Amino acid sequence: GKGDRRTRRGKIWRGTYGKYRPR
Amino acid sequence: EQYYGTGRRKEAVARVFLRPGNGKVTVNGQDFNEYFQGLVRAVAALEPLRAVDALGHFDAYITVRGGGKSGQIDAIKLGIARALVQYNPDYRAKLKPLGFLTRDARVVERKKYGKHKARRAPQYSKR
Amino acid sequence: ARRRRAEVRQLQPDLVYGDVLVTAFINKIMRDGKKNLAARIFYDACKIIQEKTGQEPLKVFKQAVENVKPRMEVRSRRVGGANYQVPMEVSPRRQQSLALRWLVQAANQRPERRAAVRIAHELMDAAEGKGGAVKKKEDVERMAEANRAYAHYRW
Amino acid sequence: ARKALIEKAKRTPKFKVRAYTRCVRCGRARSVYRFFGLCRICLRELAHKGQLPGVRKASW
Amino acid sequence: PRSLKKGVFVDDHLLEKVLELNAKGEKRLIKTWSRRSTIVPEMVGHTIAVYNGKQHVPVYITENMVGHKLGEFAPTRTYRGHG
Amino acid sequence: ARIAGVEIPRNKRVDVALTYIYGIGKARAKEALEKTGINPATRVKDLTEAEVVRLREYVENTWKLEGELRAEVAANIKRLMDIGCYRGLRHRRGLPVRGQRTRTNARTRKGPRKTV
Amino acid sequence: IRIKLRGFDHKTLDASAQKIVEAARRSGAQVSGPIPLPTRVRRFTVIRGPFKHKDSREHFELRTHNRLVDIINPNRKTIEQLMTLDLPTGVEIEIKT
RNA sequence: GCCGGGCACUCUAACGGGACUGCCCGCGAAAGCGGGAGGAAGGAGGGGACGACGUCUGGUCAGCAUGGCCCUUACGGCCUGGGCGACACACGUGCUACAAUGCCCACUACAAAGCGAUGCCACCCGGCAACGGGGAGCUAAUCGCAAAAAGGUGGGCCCAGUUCGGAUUGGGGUCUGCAACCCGACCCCAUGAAGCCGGAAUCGCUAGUAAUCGCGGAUCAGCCAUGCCGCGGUGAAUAC
Ligand SMILES: [Mg+2]
Ligand SMILES: [Mg+2]
Ligand SMILES: [Mg+2]
Ligand SMILES: [Mg+2]
Ligand SMILES: [Mg+2]
Ligand SMILES: [Mg+2]
Ligand SMILES: [Mg+2]
Ligand SMILES: [Mg+2]
Ligand SMILES: [Mg+2]
Ligand SMILES: [Mg+2]
Ligand SMILES: [Mg+2]
Ligand SMILES: [Mg+2]
Ligand SMILES: [Mg+2]
Ligand SMILES: [Mg+2]
Ligand SMILES: [Mg+2]
Ligand SMILES: [Mg+2]
Ligand SMILES: [Mg+2]
Ligand SMILES: [Mg+2]
Ligand SMILES: [Mg+2]
Ligand SMILES: [Mg+2]
Ligand SMILES: [Mg+2]
Ligand SMILES: [Mg+2]
Ligand SMILES: [Mg+2]
Ligand SMILES: [Mg+2]
Ligand SMILES: [Mg+2]
Ligand SMILES: [Mg+2]
Ligand SMILES: [Mg+2]
Ligand SMILES: [Mg+2]
Ligand SMILES: [Mg+2]
Ligand SMILES: [Mg+2]
Ligand SMILES: [Mg+2]
Ligand SMILES: [Mg+2]
Ligand SMILES: [Mg+2]
Ligand SMILES: [Mg+2]
Ligand SMILES: [Zn+2]
């Protein structure tokens, strides 16, 4: 998962946000 | 009326208050079993009361800061033990053989330059 | 190692059975320092060997432990131009370690899909003298018996 | 390319993107700390000499 | 990409040359160092010499190749393979 | 085949199955099941022939799928390759297109190593 | 009523952090004590040699210690005599109300 | 802890105390060694700083310094563009994985060290979102970055190249910047590759360690950081 941008765990990895990790 | 010991483990600090009552135990404004739910490691924090048969005899207001839930647990386990030693000085016997009065300086070791962590060295290839 | 023998780490007795042996078993189950899951994984199986086998979980565990404990093993020793496999007694310390290790190892070879169940059934098979956990111990023992020829080579 | 570069470095450029820091003591273009204005080499040299106010070795 | 809220970028000096010629009717040659530019609708049919670092590369623009950058049509590297 | 032109996996939840279509991902799956009022949790084997044709009709009509999708994307590279764009030469020499190093890795575009 | 004390060396902060507090404790009247606020620390880490040798660095730190003192009950005998104080070089002051 | 009120407690940050084989049994000529006690701490308490004479005619004339040798309408300098980012291949260090002790969604906990006045930006609104327009606080134990994450509760997936894995590409957008073609990051729709646990071989770690989890900082317009320097959470196995 950690490489998969379209997931929660994925955007935590990058340190960014979106629909798949909201702030 | 009240008995306080200071409990520390890691970054976790324990303000624990022993008071004669049913056996109710509270951490940061929640019931013990609510604040430590599913933490199998919890029930052992309330150990020193078994060292002197105190399962029902005391209530507890407890705040907690620093570390995590199991570092916070070990601090508590120290503090309620710490607090008993004042309520009854004769309780020193049957508390030292359990090592309940002693607090370990075991803390996360410094990340060292030239390493991946504190000790994990970078992998190396000769020929 | 070189200066003095290692000091054997005494564990914290498990909170559900006060037992220093179950705790160990937990750690060999624990991946990635996530004891909480590994604790449940064990404890669930206890409930599972409770369902299918009405007697004390801890009782099934301790007999199965005993049935995987190996009494002899061969251990390497190159005398000359060959490496001669010498048989030696297994210290009670080591028996426990290998037994607990093979229990989990054999457990994870099983096909049933959840970790709780795998532990349960292998413990069910091990206390009754079946299962891969034993298939390891029997293997290790026949290997040892096979080399009673080199038995005089003890250190 | 050397002295013309420490000199090209101070003058205000053709666009503000092109601003780059050059170690005010020796002219090193790489590893230049904002706080001191120095490069990690000079950083250590002035410091060791005790000419860097409040600066001392970290040991923990 | 180039932020839609802002502009569609063409280096000022080149845009003028196209538009000057549009009046007169095109087309001579256009030696340029404008890779950062956008091919732009007014440029179709012209023959522009783009600098790839080395040469001034003759590119006839068409109705199909508009939204791109100029330098996409002036290759920076020579590669014929290995062996 | 059921929808669309392909026969989505029966025995899976209706929302997952749809992603077994070229052109419909997890988003577009919940998105089709919203505008038709179909339960995202139900197994495909348990659709009404009514629910089928409704779900069928939306998806096929809103988005380009399977064949034509491939066709345009094809033509999209077709043109890019043919205008002589930089991204064209990279497709025509079969190399990567998006500013990756080629000195190592780059394998997915390059293929198994052609050792020397 | 507020005094803020800030320096690089603490042994000269505490000298001056006591000295100001003794003054107002003299000329009336209330001193809420030298309260030591947390220090703000900027570490500098650097490769030792001038060239390569990455696995060997050196650690430097810079400690900007903080102090606060509260002279509460003013008595403008303090308002003149503070304007004349012997506060050593490595230390800053900020005065508020 | 919002007000009174208090510094008791947690803390913040300076100055002290304490540990010394000092006491006991014993083996010892002695220095010490095994054990016992008191004690938070025990026999160098854990970690750090600190690296002898020298070795490698080791490394760095490209950080700087410097003898000498060399160039002078140029081996100096200014610019625009390109290259340092190439790709039949080989190797080193890594990241993410091949899954159920797992993946996913919702709700819900507990850290630390740092950092921040064209800086961090609470909160409100437009947006699927990156972001965008408002706008309060904070020269910062006050205000912000900020959610820590693994964890806990519940629900879904059901052994499948898959709701595993997230490369490759197509299409569409945000931002930084004069400018993102070569050659930035990020967001969204679609595409969904290799990979089923790795040949000969080979690396690290002795306890709060290894393994796993997130957080910050330097550089810095943005960023190719999965790198580096730190910080806490959880937390082993084993040394005959
Ligand atoms: Mg996925
Ligand atoms: Mg992982
Ligand atoms: Mg419980
Ligand atoms: Mg750690
Ligand atoms: Mg390294
Ligand atoms: Mg090396
Ligand atoms: Mg086995
Ligand atoms: Mg010079
Ligand atoms: Mg710049
Ligand atoms: Mg610089
Ligand atoms: Mg699909
Ligand atoms: Mg490239
Ligand atoms: Mg006091
Ligand atoms: Mg001794
Ligand atoms: Mg040499
Ligand atoms: Mg030189
Ligand atoms: Mg020289
Ligand atoms: Mg390079
Ligand atoms: Mg290889
Ligand atoms: Mg890497
Ligand atoms: Mg590798
Ligand atoms: Mg596939
Ligand atoms: Mg670019
Ligand atoms: Mg998938
Ligand atoms: Mg395959
Ligand atoms: Mg499989
Ligand atoms: Mg693996
Ligand atoms: Mg492996
Ligand atoms: Mg081998
Ligand atoms: Mg060691
Ligand atoms: Mg920063
Ligand atoms: Mg950055
Ligand atoms: Mg890149
Ligand atoms: Mg990071
Ligand atoms: Zn310098």
Cα distance between the two ends of chain B: 73
Q: Into how many domains does chain B fold?
A: 1
Q: What span, in angstroms and rounded, lies between the C-alpha atoms of C72 and C138? A: 10
Alpha-carbon distances, residue G56 vs G13, G51, G59 (angstroms): 34, 11, 10
* Domain assignment of residue B82, given as a range: 1-127
Instruction: Quote the crossing angle between the two packed helices C57-68 and C115-126, to the nearest 10°.
Output: 70
Domain ranges for chain C: 1-155
Q: Which residue gives the smallest C-alpha to C1' distance to H62?
A: G51
Please tell me what resolution, in angstroms, this structure has: 2.8
Query: Does the beta carbon of C40 lie under 8 angstroms from any beta carbon of chain B?
Result: yes
Alpha-carbon distances, residue C59 vs C50, C54, C65, C66, C117 (angstroms): 11, 11, 10, 11, 17
Provide, as residue numbers in chain B, all residues whose Cβ is less than 8 Å from the Cβ of G59. Answer: 113
The CATH number assigned to the domain with range E1-83 reads 3.30.860.10
Closest listed residue to residue B49, CA positions, set B97, B9, B104, B94: B94
Tell me how crowded residue D18 is: count the other CB atoms within 10 A of its CB: 10
Closest listed residue to residue E43, CA positions, set E52, E34, E55: E34
Distance G59 CA to ligand 16 centre (A): 28
Question: Which are the contacts of C56, defined by CB distance < 8 A and separation ≥ 6?
Answer: none
Closest listed residue to residue D39, CA positions, set D55, D56, D22, D54: D22
How many Cα atoms are found within 13 Å in the side-chain-facing hemisphere of G20? 30
Q: State the SS3 of chain F.
A: CCECCCECCECEEHHHHHCCCCCCCHHHHHHHHHCCCCCCCCEHHHCCHHHHHHHHHHHHHHCCCHHHHHHHHHHHHHHHHHHCCHHHHHHHCCCCCCCCCCCCCCHHHHCCCCCC
Q: What span, in angstroms and rounded, lies between the C-alpha atoms of F61 and G50? A: 67
**Contact between residue B116 and residue B122 where contact means Cβ atoms under 8 Å apart:** yes
Helix (H) or strand (E) segment spanning residue E21? helix E12-24
Token pair recorded at residue C76: 């390497």
Buried b (16+ CB within 10 A) or exposed e, B20-48: eeeeebbbeeeebeebbeebbbbebbbeb
The enclosing domain of B123 has a CATH number of: 3.30.230.10
Backbone angles phi, psi at C135, to 5 degrees: -55, -25
Q: Flag if E64 and F86 touch (Cβ within 8 Å).
A: no
F11 by Cβ neighbours in 10 Å (0-12 / 13-18 / 19+) ranks as: exposed
Q: Which of residues 19-38 of G touch strand H (CB under 7 A)?
A: 35-38
DSSP state of G22: H
DSSP state of D39: B
Q: What span, in angstroms and rounded, lies between the C-alpha atoms of C102 and C70? A: 11
Q: Which residue of B has its CA nearest to G47?
A: B113
Backbone angles phi, psi at F43, to 5 degrees: -70, 140
Q: What span, in angstroms and rounded, lies between the C-alpha atoms of F17 and F20? A: 5
Token pair recorded at residue B96: 């030292």
CA D25 to chain centre: 6
Distance from CA of F58 to the nearest CA of E (A): 32
Question: Which are the contacts of F66, defined by CB distance < 8 A and separation ≥ 6?
Answer: F4, F5, F6, F21, F22, F23
**Contact between residue B19 and residue B1 where contact means Cβ atoms under 8 Å apart:** yes
Domains of chain D: 1-60 (4.10.830.10)
Residues in chain D: 60
How many Cα atoms are found within 13 Å in the side-chain-facing hemisphere of F12? 10
Whether any strand H atom is under 7 angstroms from the Cβ of B117: the reply reads: yes
CA D56 to chain centre: 19
* Strand pairing class (B12-20; E56-60): unpaired
Backbone angles phi, psi at E53, to 5 degrees: 105, -30
Helix (H) or strand (E) segment spanning residue G95? strand G91-96
* Strand pairing class (B12-20; B3-9): antiparallel
Buried b (16+ CB within 10 A) or exposed e, F73-84: eeeeeeebeebe
Q: What span, in angstroms and rounded, lies between the C-alpha atoms of B118 and B110? A: 6
Token pair recorded at residue B11: 């970054």
Residues in a beta bridge with F91: none
Residue with tokens 């532990």: C119
**Contact between residue C90 and residue C121 where contact means Cβ atoms under 8 Å apart:** no
DSSP state of E42: G
DSSP state of D32: B
- From the candidates C9, C11, C12, C15, which should be mutated to test the interface with B, based on the most B CB atoms within 10 A? C15
Residue with tokens 């085949």: F1
Q: Which of residues 6-45 of B touch strand H (CB under 7 A)?
A: 6, 8, 10-13, 15, 28, 35, 37-39, 41
Q: What span, in angstroms and rounded, lies between the C-alpha atoms of C39 and B39? A: 10
Question: Which are the contacts of D52, defined by CB distance < 8 A and separation ≥ 6?
Answer: D36, D43, D46
Q: What span, in angstroms and rounded, lies between the C-alpha atoms of E71 and E53? A: 10
Closest listed residue to residue G45, CA positions, set B113, D52, B108: B113
Q: Largest alpha-carbon pair distance within chain C?
A: 57
**Contact between residue F78 and residue F51 where contact means Cβ atoms under 8 Å apart:** no
* Strand pairing class (D55-57; C86-89): unpaired
Distance B22 CA to ligand 15 centre (A): 82
The per-residue DSSP string of B43-71 comes to: TTTT-TTTTTT-TTTEEEEEEEESS-HHH
Q: Which CATH superfamily is domain C1-155 in?
A: Ribosomal protein S7/S5 (1.10.455.10)
C94 by Cβ neighbours in 10 Å (0-12 / 13-18 / 19+) ranks as: middle
Q: State the SS3 of G49-84.
A: CCCCCCCCEEEEEEEEEEEEEEECCCCCHHHHHCCC
Q: Is E82 helix (H, G, I), strand (E, B) or coil?
A: coil
Token pair recorded at residue C77: 């020793």
Token pair recorded at residue C40: 């449940």
Residues in chain A: 23
Q: Tell me, what amino acid is at C81?
A: G
Cα distance between the two ends of chain A: 20
Q: What span, in angstroms and rounded, lies between the C-alpha atoms of E47 and E57? A: 9
